[PDB]
Design a protein around this motif. Structure first.
Motif, PDB file in Angstrom:
ATOM      1  N   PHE A   6      -7.593  -2.171  13.130  1.00 43.18           N
ATOM      2  CA  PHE A   6      -7.932  -3.382  12.338  1.00 43.18           C
ATOM      3  C   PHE A   6      -7.458  -3.167  10.901  1.00 43.18           C
ATOM      4  CE2 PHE A   6     -10.375  -6.647  10.280  1.00 43.18           C
ATOM      5  CZ  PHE A   6     -10.384  -7.654  11.251  1.00 43.18           C
ATOM      6  N   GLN A   7      -7.330  -1.934  10.494  1.00 41.47           N
ATOM      7  CA  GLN A   7      -6.859  -1.653   9.112  1.00 41.47           C
ATOM      8  C   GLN A   7      -5.333  -1.537   9.124  1.00 41.47           C
ATOM      9  OE1 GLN A   7      -4.753   0.082   6.484  1.00 41.47           O
ATOM     10  NE2 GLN A   7      -5.410   1.618   7.889  1.00 41.47           N
ATOM     11  N   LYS A   8      -4.761  -1.289  10.273  1.00 40.15           N
ATOM     12  CA  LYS A   8      -3.279  -1.136  10.355  1.00 40.15           C
ATOM     13  C   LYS A   8      -2.598  -2.484  10.627  1.00 40.15           C
ATOM     14  CE  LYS A   8      -3.918   3.338  10.204  1.00 40.15           C
ATOM     15  NZ  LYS A   8      -3.310   4.198   9.149  1.00 40.15           N
ATOM     16  N   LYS A   9      -3.039  -3.204  11.627  1.00 40.39           N
ATOM     17  CA  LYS A   9      -2.382  -4.505  11.957  1.00 40.39           C
ATOM     18  C   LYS A   9      -2.988  -5.662  11.155  1.00 40.39           C
ATOM     19  CE  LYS A   9      -5.693  -5.284  15.616  1.00 40.39           C
ATOM     20  NZ  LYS A   9      -6.002  -4.886  17.018  1.00 40.39           N
ATOM     21  N   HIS A  10      -4.287  -5.782  11.119  1.00 37.73           N
ATOM     22  CA  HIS A  10      -4.900  -6.921  10.373  1.00 37.73           C
ATOM     23  C   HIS A  10      -4.821  -6.689   8.862  1.00 37.73           C
ATOM     24  CE1 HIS A  10      -6.194  -9.506  13.515  1.00 37.73           C
ATOM     25  NE2 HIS A  10      -6.734  -8.518  14.230  1.00 37.73           N
ATOM     26  N   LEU A  11      -4.478  -5.506   8.422  1.00 33.17           N
ATOM     27  CA  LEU A  11      -4.391  -5.253   6.944  1.00 33.17           C
ATOM     28  C   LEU A  11      -3.024  -4.666   6.594  1.00 33.17           C
ATOM     29  CD1 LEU A  11      -7.398  -5.777   7.053  1.00 33.17           C
ATOM     30  CD2 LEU A  11      -7.664  -3.959   5.363  1.00 33.17           C
ATOM     31  N   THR A  12      -2.610  -4.818   5.362  1.00 33.69           N
ATOM     32  CA  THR A  12      -1.296  -4.251   4.937  1.00 33.69           C
ATOM     33  C   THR A  12      -1.451  -3.618   3.553  1.00 33.69           C
ATOM     34  OG1 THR A  12       0.948  -4.831   4.304  1.00 33.69           O
ATOM     35  CG2 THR A  12      -0.735  -6.543   4.064  1.00 33.69           C
ATOM     36  N   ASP A  13      -0.362  -3.290   2.903  1.00 34.79           N
ATOM     37  CA  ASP A  13      -0.461  -2.647   1.556  1.00 34.79           C
ATOM     38  C   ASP A  13       0.238  -3.499   0.490  1.00 34.79           C
ATOM     39  OD1 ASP A  13      -1.317  -0.818   3.361  1.00 34.79           O
ATOM     40  OD2 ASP A  13      -0.602   0.864   2.221  1.00 34.79           O
ATOM     41  N   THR A  14       0.453  -4.764   0.735  1.00 37.06           N
ATOM     42  CA  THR A  14       1.130  -5.597  -0.302  1.00 37.06           C
ATOM     43  C   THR A  14       0.932  -7.084  -0.003  1.00 37.06           C
ATOM     44  OG1 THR A  14       3.258  -6.011  -1.351  1.00 37.06           O
ATOM     45  CG2 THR A  14       3.240  -5.659   1.033  1.00 37.06           C
ATOM     46  N   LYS A  15       0.989  -7.909  -1.015  1.00 34.22           N
ATOM     47  CA  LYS A  15       0.817  -9.372  -0.800  1.00 34.22           C
ATOM     48  C   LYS A  15       2.083  -9.933  -0.154  1.00 34.22           C
ATOM     49  CE  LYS A  15      -1.987  -9.434  -4.940  1.00 34.22           C
ATOM     50  NZ  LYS A  15      -2.287 -10.233  -6.161  1.00 34.22           N
ATOM     51  N   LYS A  16       3.180  -9.236  -0.294  1.00 30.11           N
ATOM     52  CA  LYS A  16       4.463  -9.705   0.307  1.00 30.11           C
ATOM     53  C   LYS A  16       4.912  -8.697   1.365  1.00 30.11           C
ATOM     54  CE  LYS A  16       5.559  -8.877  -3.880  1.00 30.11           C
ATOM     55  NZ  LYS A  16       5.185  -7.562  -4.472  1.00 30.11           N
ATOM     56  N   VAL A  17       4.152  -8.546   2.414  1.00 30.67           N
ATOM     57  CA  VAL A  17       4.531  -7.569   3.474  1.00 30.67           C
ATOM     58  C   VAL A  17       5.958  -7.815   3.922  1.00 30.67           C
ATOM     59  CG1 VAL A  17       2.178  -7.443   4.279  1.00 30.67           C
ATOM     60  CG2 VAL A  17       3.725  -9.160   5.222  1.00 30.67           C
ATOM     61  N   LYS A  18       6.485  -6.909   4.690  1.00 31.05           N
ATOM     62  CA  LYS A  18       7.866  -7.082   5.200  1.00 31.05           C
ATOM     63  C   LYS A  18       7.776  -7.644   6.613  1.00 31.05           C
ATOM     64  CE  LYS A  18       8.512  -2.597   4.646  1.00 31.05           C
ATOM     65  NZ  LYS A  18       7.145  -2.359   4.101  1.00 31.05           N
ATOM     66  N   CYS A  19       7.267  -8.840   6.737  1.00 32.08           N
ATOM     67  CA  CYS A  19       7.109  -9.472   8.077  1.00 32.08           C
ATOM     68  C   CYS A  19       8.240  -9.041   9.020  1.00 32.08           C
ATOM     69  CB  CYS A  19       7.145 -10.993   7.917  1.00 32.08           C
ATOM     70  SG  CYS A  19       5.575 -11.561   7.222  1.00 32.08           S
ATOM     71  N   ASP A  20       9.449  -8.994   8.529  1.00 34.12           N
ATOM     72  CA  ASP A  20      10.599  -8.595   9.391  1.00 34.12           C
ATOM     73  C   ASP A  20      10.246  -7.328  10.171  1.00 34.12           C
ATOM     74  OD1 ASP A  20      12.947  -6.593   9.661  1.00 34.12           O
ATOM     75  OD2 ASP A  20      13.830  -8.557   9.743  1.00 34.12           O
TER      76      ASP A  20
END
Length: 105
Positions: A6-20
């Protein structure tokens, strides 16, 4: 299912993740839609402390979450984020379920 993933997929480390890659990586396989939450671990596990077992909670204001949206090309997504309260389920003190966007349904 687990504060970890839940911290890896539902959360990230930036407001502009690299969706790609946040989707074309390996745990997703280039899907079409994706969502995550921009917050630091302490503040995340902290918003669950003092809480009870599995129960439905909700942010007290808003939260900036990045979101991937595939509408063109085969494996490409658009970057879209916004600040809004979100309903989520937490146990004794560990968030692991993502209810939905905005306040509860």
């Amino acid at each position: 299912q687990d504060w970890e993933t839940f911290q890896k997929k539902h959360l990230t480390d930036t407001k502009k993740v690299k969706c790609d890659v946040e989707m074309a990586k390996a745990l997703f396989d280039c899907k079409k839609t994706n969502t995550f939450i921009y917050a630091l671990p302490g503040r995340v596990k902290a918003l669950c402390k003092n809480i009870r077992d599995n129960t439905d909670v909700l942010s007290r204001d808003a939260f900036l979450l990045p979101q991937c949206d595939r509408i063109k090309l085969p494996c490409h997504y658009k970057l879209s984020s916004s600040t809004n309260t979100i309903c989520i389920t937490c146990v004794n003190q560990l968030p692991i379920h993502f209810a939905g966007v905005g306040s509860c349904p």
